[PDB]
Structure formats: structure tokens, C-alpha cells
């Protein structure tokens, strides 16, 4: 069967400090939906909770035309094997491997995490991370989507389709005061533009590479980039359309509360064939 629940056990070493979490979840694999509660079992976290983002299960995502190979080697049990590698722009690495087993509709996750070079000043050691968010490239191609007719600006009537109390939004947004939102208005005003966007990939019928790039917001609003290289490694061979239409693009979006100890989780998925 296609996944219900779930549990994760994520645990290893942040700049050489071992932690450790175990927790519950749930989801639809109708739809892509995730939702998890994790609780440490070694006390406090002692960098932040956010760098487990997006790391804290495919298996829940559809694809447009059927399941994803992800669903698909769930759903006959054969399963696959993931190793992420993660960079920081402050020269700090994460690196990520995870492993599953299947009970029925019930996934048992365990995830590895090993990572090093995060500056005791850093935005991760001093617990500065508040949301995950798209690249400023990714960003952009959203606004030059609303900015319908190539001018360079958000105006009053093509910031109608964003909302679809408009005026003063708009007036509030537009901070230079000059009558329409600019690229920097928008980058400010940021509800619905926080999907990430992966790329994946078939080099072979038994590996996909996935890849993104994004940024952390910090608590003094400025951004913390990464990038992503994400090899998915199945025990069978992918079906022959999965070869074929490559390559796929998946929107993520994830939203995170937290103590220094409990995490509780959501995460939206949708798969597309165009970027
Ligand atoms: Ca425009
Ligand atoms: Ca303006």
C-alpha cells in the first residue's frame, strides 16, 4: 500500500556535538502532505532546529500522471536508499543519509546526520534561523511571472493577481512610495511565494538526482544560502516512464514550530514537468 504514517529517528553530529531525536507523523499521499512531531532524547538542541529543514519522505508525493518512483518502490516494497550532501556559503557542510523500512501503510525513517565547519557565530550555532525560503533566482522568476507586461514593476492592476484590504497592501508595500512594487518591494512583502523548487534527474534506471538551491532567513532578516545534491539509490529498477520524463520539477513548501527540544513539522509537495 501507499504510506499513512510515519516515523523518523535523525540523529548524529553538528560541529562534532552529538544529538539525537525520535517522533510520529502522518500524511497524504494523495496530495503530498507531511506532518511530524520530533522530540530530542539527549536534551537541549544546541544549534538550530532549522537545519534539519528540509531534511526531517518521498514516498508521500505523487506525480502528475501516477505515483512517484518513490511511491512506486514503497508500494512494492523493494525501497531505496537516499544520501544528501548539503553547502553552506559560509564553507559549512551537512551531509544526510537515510534508510527505510515498511510495515504495511507505516514507514520506520532513520536518518544520519554528520555536519561540520558552522561558525560559533554563525546563523546556525546561535539559533538565528527562522523560515526556509526560495532562491532569489526562484524568487524572481515568481515576480517576472506577475509582471505581465515585461515593465519591471508590479503594478496596481498586475498586483491584482497576486491577491488573487488590496489598496493599502499595495500602498504599504511599495516603500519608495513611487506608485508600484520593484523586485526588492516584493522580496520585502513575502505568503505564497515559498515553494522551493527541486530538479531531479535518471543518469540510470536505479539512481535519481535531485538538486536545490536556497536560503535560511536569519532573525537580523538577512539570508543564509545552501545548496543541495540529493542521490536516490532504488533496490529494483525504476519503470520505463520515469526514464522518459526527466527531467521533473518538485515545489516544496515547509513550515516549522519549535522548542529546543520538540519539532512539529509540515511539509506540501508538487511534482510538475515544466520549471
Ligand atoms: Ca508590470
Ligand atoms: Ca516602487
Given amino acids: 500500500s501507499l504510506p499513512a504514517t510515519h516515523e523518523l529517528h535523525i540523529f548524529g553530529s553538528i560541529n562534532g556535538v552529538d544529538f539525537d531525536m525520535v517522533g510520529q507523523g502522518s500524511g497524504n499521499p494523495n496530495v503530498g502532505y507531511e506532518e511530524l512531531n520530533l522530540k ?20 508521500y508525493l505523487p506525480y502528475p500522471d501516477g505515483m512517484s518512483p518513490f511511491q512506486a518502490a514503497m508500494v512494492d516494497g ?13 564553507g559549512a ?42 532562491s532569489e533566482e526562484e ?3 515568481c515576480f517576472r511571472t506577475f509582471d505581465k507586461d515585461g515593465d519591471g514593476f508590479i503594478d496596481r492592476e498586475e498586483f491584482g493577481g497576486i491577491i488573487r484590504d488590496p489598496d493599502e497592501i499595495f500602498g504599504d508595500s511599495d516603500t519608495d512610495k513611487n506608485g508600484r512594487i520593484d523586485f526588492d518591494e516584493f522580496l520585502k512583502m513575502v505568503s505564497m511565494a515559498d515553494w522551493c523548487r527541486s530538479k531531479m534527474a535518471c543518469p540510470n534506471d536505479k539512481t535519481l538526482i535531485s538538486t536545490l538551491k536556497w536560503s535560511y532567513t536569519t532573525g537580523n532578516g538577512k539570508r543564509y544560502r545552501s545548496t543541495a545534491r540529493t542521490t536516490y539509490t532504488f533496490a529494483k529498477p525504476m519503470a520505463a516512464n520515469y526514464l522518459k520524463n526527466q527531467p521533473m520539477y518538485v515545489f516544496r513548501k515547509t513550515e516549522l514550530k519549535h522548542s529546543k527540544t520538540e519539532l512539529n513539522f509540515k511539509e506540501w509537495q508538487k511534482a510538475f514537468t515544466d520549471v
Avoid: C
Fill in 139 to 141: 524568487l524572481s522568476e
Fill in 78 to 90: 523493494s525501497g531505496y536508499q537516499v544520501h544528501r550532501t548539503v553547502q553552506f556559503e559560509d
Fill in 40 to 59: 530530542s532524547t539527549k536534551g537541549d538542541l544546541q544549534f538550530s532546529p532549522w537545519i534539519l529543514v528540509p531534511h526531517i519522505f518521498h514516498q
Fill in 93 to 134: 557542510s551537512l551531509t544526510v543519509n537515510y534508510r527505510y523500512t515498511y510495515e504495511g501503510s507505516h514507514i520506520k525513517g532513520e536518518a544520519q546526520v554528520k555536519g561540520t565547519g558552522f561558525p560559533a557565530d554563525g546563523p546556525v550555532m546561535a539559533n538565528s534561523l527562522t523560515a526556509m525560503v526560495p
